[PDB]
Amino acid sequence: ATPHINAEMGDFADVVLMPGDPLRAKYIAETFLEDAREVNNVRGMLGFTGTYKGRKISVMGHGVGIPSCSIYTKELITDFGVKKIIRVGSCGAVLPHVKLRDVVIGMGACTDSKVNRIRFKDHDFAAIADFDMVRNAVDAAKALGIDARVGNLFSADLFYSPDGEMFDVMEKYGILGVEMEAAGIYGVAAEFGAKALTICTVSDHIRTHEQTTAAERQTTFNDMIKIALESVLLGDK
Amino acid sequence: ATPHINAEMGDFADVVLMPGDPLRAKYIAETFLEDAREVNNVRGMLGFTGTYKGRKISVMGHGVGIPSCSIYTKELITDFGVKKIIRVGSCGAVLPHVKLRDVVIGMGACTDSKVNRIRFKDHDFAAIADFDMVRNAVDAAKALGIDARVGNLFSADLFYSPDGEMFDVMEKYGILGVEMEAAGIYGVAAEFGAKALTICTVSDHIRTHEQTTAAERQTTFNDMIKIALESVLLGDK
Amino acid sequence: ATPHINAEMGDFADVVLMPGDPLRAKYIAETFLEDAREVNNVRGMLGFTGTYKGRKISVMGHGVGIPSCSIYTKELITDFGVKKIIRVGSCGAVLPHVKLRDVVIGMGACTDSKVNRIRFKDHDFAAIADFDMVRNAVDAAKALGIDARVGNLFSADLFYSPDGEMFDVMEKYGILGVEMEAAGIYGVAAEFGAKALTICTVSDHIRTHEQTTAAERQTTFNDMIKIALESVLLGDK
Amino acid sequence: ATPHINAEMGDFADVVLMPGDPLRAKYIAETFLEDAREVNNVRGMLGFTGTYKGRKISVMGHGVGIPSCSIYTKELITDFGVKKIIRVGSCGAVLPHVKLRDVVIGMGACTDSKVNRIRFKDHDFAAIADFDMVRNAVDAAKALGIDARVGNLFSADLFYSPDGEMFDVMEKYGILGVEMEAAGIYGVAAEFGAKALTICTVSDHIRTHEQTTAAERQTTFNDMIKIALESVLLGDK
Amino acid sequence: ATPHINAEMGDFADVVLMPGDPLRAKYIAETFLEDAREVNNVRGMLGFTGTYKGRKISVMGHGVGIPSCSIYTKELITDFGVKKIIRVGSCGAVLPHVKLRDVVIGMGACTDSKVNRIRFKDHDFAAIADFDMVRNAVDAAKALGIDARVGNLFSADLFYSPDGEMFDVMEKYGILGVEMEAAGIYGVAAEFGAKALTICTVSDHIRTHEQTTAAERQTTFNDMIKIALESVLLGDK
Amino acid sequence: ATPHINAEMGDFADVVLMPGDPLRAKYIAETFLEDAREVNNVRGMLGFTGTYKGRKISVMGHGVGIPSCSIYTKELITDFGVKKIIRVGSCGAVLPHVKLRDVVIGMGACTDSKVNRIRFKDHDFAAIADFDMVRNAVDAAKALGIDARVGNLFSADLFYSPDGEMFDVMEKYGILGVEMEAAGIYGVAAEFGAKALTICTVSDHIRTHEQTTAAERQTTFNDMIKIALESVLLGDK
Ligand SMILES: Cc1ncnc2c1ncn2[C@H]1C[C@H](O)[C@@H](CO)O1
Ligand SMILES: Cc1ncnc2c1ncn2[C@H]1C[C@H](O)[C@@H](CO)O1
Ligand SMILES: Cc1ncnc2c1ncn2[C@H]1C[C@H](O)[C@@H](CO)O1
Ligand SMILES: Cc1ncnc2c1ncn2[C@H]1C[C@H](O)[C@@H](CO)O1
Ligand SMILES: Cc1ncnc2c1ncn2[C@H]1C[C@H](O)[C@@H](CO)O1
Ligand SMILES: Cc1ncnc2c1ncn2[C@H]1C[C@H](O)[C@@H](CO)O1
């Protein structure tokens, strides 16, 4: 057991999907996983383990922010033998052509956090996902009839940033989505020799304000989970 | 309502206690508050509002990490008229004389996060608590027969830091406890003109390893809540 | 003796009040101290030792700037057994509400200097004063019927800064006064294990642009001194 | 024409392969391109344009260092309509498993330079290659039965660094190869909206200390070129 | 008059020699200048104006540290028509071959202060002296038969630096002397359009720990003054 | 031989003139040196050795950028006995009074590169040239009747800087010319124990956008060469 995970080696699959909303852990378990079992409840961060088409998979939230997800991803890697971590969440878009409900795959992740500089002797560490996982997610999406967008995400420490102009810089450099974990998870993965990938659906615009019915979300959300799960099966091949 | 708080102005008291463990919100509500009511459940972050000796008070978790707590504290201040925020949690000690179960009041808060530099034009912003709140907590503790320790806390972005030596620097500079929110909350308070204070009980040593029975914790925890709540009443005077 | 202080262990009291102007030290000693004697003259940085209501007390200028006061405070602590240092000076206001002749107690101090970053491994070190000393100062003020504002000061390296935009930043984040020593003195207090406090009187308002020099301004300066001196008496008890 | 390129819009193909050694460009053009003609000679930075299996292709050295390649890639993109840039060079390994003659595809690139910080408001910009170009390169390698490692490269500013400790840091975080251009080229691609990729062959192992120069090493260099050229053909389809 | 100087235009010469210690300014005036007249006493920072071989000259202390010297140099340049500032202070030696009483001309000045970074958008500003003034000092020394090393000085913010290893870095890069003003004075000269030069007398050796001993605190301190004064005459010619 | 130079000790003179463009190195050799002999061709970075008025002299390109020039200067200093490096390149003017064809002597060199910060523990290293070499150039110019400004140069990493406003900062602080090597060369000279000086010919004006036009690309470029060569002779004397 670890400080934030009351479980033992083997309780988690070697692949773990992690939503930002804690409530989504249970939802994913009862909707996509078979024969699921609870493996953690520490601090209310419910963790589950089951199988998807025979493949063992676990699901558990990571909390909002690099600090929070750095804890869970780290403990899972070093103490529970986790090899892959797929973050499934939302993101705000700064580009005009990126619309709500669009699926973005963060091959890379910029950030204004200092965690990676702390790790890389104050130099620039390119926080990146595992290449194979990226391609697995892209193909999985294609197979479902979805055209995902692959590029850079921006992991912000402040949802309410005082530097509004930074969003302009993000757009100017091709940032596809703004979230709050990617860079941190990728940093942890590199630090402890694991693999990671972040998949997000555009929840809103950081310049205007589009609209998406309640159904659209729940539907696109299921689509994102399917992409993640099927990407794992492609990876196993 | 806000992105992370599904409530309206008035649903929260002007004073809010915020634990790091989400589960503690409900516990505090049913143990110390009277006539409590649920005011939020978004993303599973239960929020409650009641009265303590006639004084209106709300309680709700803030999540682990500066990013997470910066969201909640901000939304509460700007959209729900909150004037005071008291964080109640745990902390790791680096000083030999600071023992487990000790109560530490963070008058100041150092950090390795970049949020404050982002706010202060890359200069040094002294993340501090409201002075009156600090003295209210100190006196409240005294009245309960508890000698609190007042000084600097260190808000770390990484629970599992690669820079072990930094803990040596912390000890050399009088850091009383290492946690993961203070500096961020104090930053938000200064940014939006509110008042904040962080109170923590030593959960462990970052050099050795003492011991505290399960009872000791639950007991000292109740003590910390009492200190916080009574400090509010002293502030009202 | 030291390179900057030509005196011997014992000449100084364990409590030293330090104004920026060395001629101000002479003023303080002759005005408030009984049986005072000059204990230092090096570089014209006058130092004195006498008694206030029977208590042994010393006063000595610290020169302008963090680099200057860092030397004198350090030497007083490591070579003259000084346990407490109270800076009594002036500052410029940036807050509309902060008026001329207002007494400000710097519980914390922000800064443009990099001295604390050098000390704190390039991270954010919250330069704060000793809690008890702040409490004694506030209680002393109250006793004298003098209102006192407790908060953050800003220790600038350049009295004539090339970027006036920082002033709006200070105002936005609640800085009570701009001086040039507090942050440095607190760094030294932490590094060498001593206690320090900074008290200042608003001599000018950078906002409406206005200085203060008259019987009223000189009356307020004396009040600050009285606050400092009486605060140590309360501390002794 | 430009200050560094004495040619006209149309002389270069929309895809340019760029080695660090200008003499290497001559080698590539004569070895793989048909009906190739020199399109630039300024500063001895030879440039050529020809066809590979009917496809118009150009090759031109980029000089050593981020500052050098930043100029040429920028000009090619903004003044010569170049849409894709493929860097084909060498790198030094730090990972025990990465062997000599191994082909490394830099999906991302870390760095000691501050060029991207200047571009990204002093925050962390993840310098990454174009996903499709990386995918085409990997598929091309596969077709040639050539194994290829996809990951992070490290673009150093100093071939002779004063701090060898950074090498252990690179190894700990999985850097596949150390070169001196990738991070800069990716920054330029992002700033000016173009697509770029860096491919390299391990010419030396900084670990066991060993270079590679022979028929086998030259065979591997040609494979990298073949990979690059064939990757563009796949992209066209 | 200015904030820190009670005088009027014309009270100072167009060239001002400035030692860190006000008492040394007084010594210089009484020893080298004829018709010496005190022009300032604010904060005890003595300033004098007189003649040397018919040439009007001023000498005034600047206090310890960059923040202090920046004030006086600025005011002199913008309100008193000062064209040349020649600092005549002391310094600590780091190089083995540099001994006490040695004269050093700082054509350049390194520093760990943030003032120049504040002025130069966080980039590296090479704080250098006026070339003509440098040559004048060299020639002056030659004529007087006094040895003088021309090179880089280090302007430290902390006389009692917590980073001892930095001295090794200074030595490796040939820093001739360690003081606390050069880089700042040069920053002001460039910002406010004036010329400056720093000349120092090795006061002590940082390695051997040998301070200014013997009656060699005069003649040597005088050599520096002689050179500075004679350098001015050469410049006038 | 070295990694980037195919030659042996003795193949180069103890003094090497270095232009950024290899072709200009070739021009210098054939135009100013007798018995010119090509000593290197690796990567096309032409190097030559011959005699000028009886004095053995070498000239070799260093490529564009700090990373490039650092390599060649380093290798020459540690493996070929080079004692003096005199860069003879071009530069862009920011000051209104500086016109094309103007000669500039960089006694100092500012920069936005991180190389010196890497060498100097993130502090400010004043990248300066060798004083004697500077004076030799001034005197040489005087004798030849060629005007020359002695001052600060700016070594930029990005020829196509995204920060246009920085040019205004350069101008305000009197930067004579903008190039891409000075600060780096000086960093190497100090690190590896050698002497260097950078002389540049205003190639274009950053404001007016006037490039090197007319047949004035020779005689002027020659003045620079004449000064550099004659400065060496003076130094030998
Ligand atoms: C403006 C902004 N910044 C950061 N994250 C944002 C955002 N707008 C939306 N998000 C998304 C992604 C986060 O992970 C999530 C936080 O609730 O919402
Ligand atoms: C080593 C370390 N770092 C940061 N926080 C620590 C810690 N040891 C204990 N804590 C405490 C305070 C945090 O808020 C909490 C996280 O679960 O545990
Ligand atoms: C407006 C302002 N800025 C910086 N320092 C100030 C100030 N007003 C007063 N001071 C204080 C601190 C210094 O020690 C001194 C400088 O005049 O007075
Ligand atoms: C070990 C090492 N370090 C830095 N750059 C290296 C390298 N091995 C190869 N390179 C590459 C990138 C440059 O363009 C060039 C320098 O020799 O080769
Ligand atoms: C060892 C050392 N470090 C820093 N500054 C030093 C020094 N020795 C002498 N000085 C100089 C510069 C200051 O202005 C002055 C303070 O005593 O002496
Ligand atoms: C305008 C400008 N900016 C940066 N470097 C410049 C320049 N004009 C000329 N140069 C110089 C220095 C480089 O080594 C070379 C590149 O063309 O010319």
**Pick from F68, F112, F115: which is nearest to D118 by CB?**
F112
Q: Indicate which technique resolved this structure.
A: X-ray
SS3 annotation, D37-63: EEEECHHHCCEEEEEECCEEEEEECCC
Alpha helices in E43-114, H assignment, sequence order = 66-79
Ligand nearest to the CA of D90: 4
Interface membership of A119 toward D (CB under 8 Å)? yes
CB-based contact D173 A119, cutoff 8 Å: yes
CB-based contact A113 B114, cutoff 8 Å: yes
Pocket test for ligand 1, best of A66, A69, A87, A90 (most atoms within 8 A of CB): A90
Instruction: Dump the DSSP string for D124-141.
Output: B--EE--HHHHHHHHHHH
Window 132-161 of D, Cβ < 8 Å to F: 156-161
Record the resolution, in angstroms. Answer: 2.2
Ligand nearest to the CA of C156: 3
Cα F181 to ligand 6 centre (Å)? 9
Distance of alpha carbon D209 from alpha carbon D224, whole angstroms = 23
DSSP C99: P
Strand partners, A178: A92, A154
Alpha helices in F146-181, H assignment, sequence order = 166-172
Q: Can you point out the beta strands (E) in chain D?
A: 15-18, 34-40, 47-52, 55-60, 84-93, 103-111, 127-128, 148-155, 177-179, 195-205
**Domain boundaries along the sequence of chain D:** 1-237
Ligand nearest to the CA of F161: 6
Minimal-distance CA residue of chain D relative to A139: D135
Distance of alpha carbon E179 from alpha carbon F237, whole angstroms = 34
Name the residue type at position E228. Answer: A
Cα F69 to ligand 1 centre (Å)? 44
Q: Are B83 and B195 contacting, i.e. CB atoms less than 8 angstroms apart? A: yes
Terminal C-alpha separation, chain F = 31
Report the SS3 class of residue A39.
strand
CA D113, chain centre distance (Å): 17
Window 21-40 of B, Cβ < 8 Å to A: 21-23
Distance of alpha carbon C123 from alpha carbon B110, whole angstroms = 8
DSSP A142: H
Interface membership of D111 toward F (CB under 8 Å)? no
F149-155 and F103-111 as β-strands: parallel, antiparallel, unpaired?
parallel
User: Which parts of C are annotated binding residues for a purine D-ribonucleoside?
Assistant: 4, 179-181, 203-204
Distance from CA of A71 to the nearest CA of B (A): 7
Rg of chain C taking only CA atoms, in angstroms: 17
**Pick from F20, F21, F162: which is nearest to D118 by CB?**
F162
Q: Which positions ≥6 away from A54 have C-beta within 8 Å?
A: none
Report the SS3 class of residue E220.
helix
C47-52 and C34-40 as β-strands: parallel, antiparallel, unpaired?
antiparallel
Name the closest-CA residue to atom 9, ligand 5.
Answer: E91
CB-based contact C112 E118, cutoff 8 Å: yes
Report the SS3 class of residue F8.
coil
CB-based contact C150 B131, cutoff 8 Å: yes
Q: Are A159 and D138 contacting, i.e. CB atoms less than 8 angstroms apart? A: no
- For ligand 4, whether the C-beta of D63 sits within 6 Å is no
Distance of alpha carbon C224 from alpha carbon A87, whole angstroms = 57
Interface membership of F126 toward E (CB under 8 Å)? yes
SS3 annotation, E97-160: CCCCCCEEEEEEEEECCCHHHHHCCCCECCCECCHHHHHHHHHHHHHHCCCCEEEEEEECCCCC
Q: Which positions ≥6 away from D184 have C-beta within 8 Å?
A: D65, D66, D67, D69, D70, D111, D113, D115, D127, D155
Tokens of D194: 């173009």
Interface membership of A121 toward D (CB under 8 Å)? yes
CA D75, chain centre distance (Å): 16
Q: Which positions ≥6 away from B37 have C-beta within 8 Å?
A: B48, B49, B50
Instruction: Of C53, C55, C31, C87, give the one whose Cα is nearest residue C218.
Output: C31
Distance of alpha carbon A188 from alpha carbon A113, whole angstroms = 13
Ramachandran angles phi, psi of A172, nearest 5°: -60, -25
Question: Which residues contact ligand 3 via a Cβ below 6 A?
Answer: C 20, 64, 89-92, 156, 159, 178-181, 203-204, 206
Q: Can you point out the beta strands (E) in F156-215?
A: 177-179, 195-205
Cα E18 to ligand 3 centre (Å)? 21
For residue D216, with 0-12 CB atoms within 10 Å meaning exposed, 13-18 middle and 19 or more buried, which class applies? exposed
Q: Are C137 and C160 contacting, i.e. CB atoms less than 8 angstroms apart? A: no
The secondary structure of chain C in percent helix, strand, coil, rounded to multiples of 5, reads 35, 30, 35
CB-based contact A126 D120, cutoff 8 Å: no
Domain spanning A1-237: which superfamily?
Answer: Nucleoside phosphorylase domain (3.40.50.1580)
Cα D123 to ligand 6 centre (Å)? 27
Cα E87 to ligand 2 centre (Å)? 51
Report the SS3 class of residue C18.
strand
Q: Are E104 and E176 contacting, i.e. CB atoms less than 8 angstroms apart? A: yes
Helix (H) or strand (E) holding D26, with range, is helix D22-32
Distance of alpha carbon C60 from alpha carbon C44, whole angstroms = 10
CA angle, F139 as apex, F138 and F142 as ends, to 5°?
90
Distance of alpha carbon E4 from alpha carbon C159, whole angstroms = 11
Cα A19 to ligand 1 centre (Å)? 13
Ramachandran angles phi, psi of E9, nearest 5°: -50, 135
Distance of alpha carbon D161 from alpha carbon D182, whole angstroms = 18
Q: Are E21 and E61 contacting, i.e. CB atoms less than 8 angstroms apart? A: yes
Distance of alpha carbon E228 from alpha carbon E235, whole angstroms = 11
Distance of alpha carbon A127 from alpha carbon A107, whole angstroms = 9
- For ligand 5, whether the C-beta of E65 sits within 6 Å is no
Distance from CA of A214 to the nearest CA of D (A): 32
* C4, C18, C68: best to mutate for the E interface, most E CBs within 10 A: C68
Give the nearest ligand 6 atom to F158 CA: 4
Instruction: Dump the DSSP string for chain B.
Output: --SS----TTSS-SEEEEESSTTHHHHHHHHT-EEEEEEE-GGG--EEEEEETTEEEEEE---SSHHHHHHHHHHHHHHH---EEEEEEEEEE-STT--TT-EEEEEEEEES-SHHHHHTTTSB---B--HHHHHHHHHHHHHTT---EEEEEEE-S-SS-S-TTHHHHHHHTT--EEESSHHHHHHHHHHTT-EEEEEEEEEEESSS-----HHHHHHHHHHHHHHHHHHHHHHT-
* CA distances for E52 relative to E39, E55, E82, E89, E181, angstroms: 17, 5, 17, 20, 25
**Pick from B22, B44, B65: which is nearest to A65 by CB?**
B65
Helix (H) or strand (E) holding A107, with range, is strand A103-111
Name all chains with 3 or more CB-CB pairs below 8 Å to chain D.
A, F
Distance of alpha carbon E110 from alpha carbon E103, whole angstroms = 18
For residue A214, with 0-12 CB atoms within 10 Å meaning exposed, 13-18 middle and 19 or more buried, which class applies? exposed
Q: Does residue E204 have an active-site annotation?
A: yes
Catalytic residue among D11, D102, D130, D204: D204
Name the residue type at position B74. Answer: K
Alpha helices in chain C, H assignment, sequence order = 22-32, 66-79, 115-119, 131-143, 165-172, 182-191, 215-236
Report the SS3 class of residue C78.
helix
Distance of alpha carbon F143 from alpha carbon B169, whole angstroms = 59
Residue E121: list chain F partners with CB under 8 A: 163, 166, 169
Give the nearest ligand 6 atom to D3 CA: 17
Distance of alpha carbon E180 from alpha carbon E157, whole angstroms = 6
Tokens of D184: 């800069």
- CB atoms under 10 Å from CB of F223, counted, come to 21
Q: Are B48 and B58 contacting, i.e. CB atoms less than 8 angstroms apart? A: yes
The secondary structure of chain E in percent helix, strand, coil, rounded to multiples of 5, reads 35, 30, 35
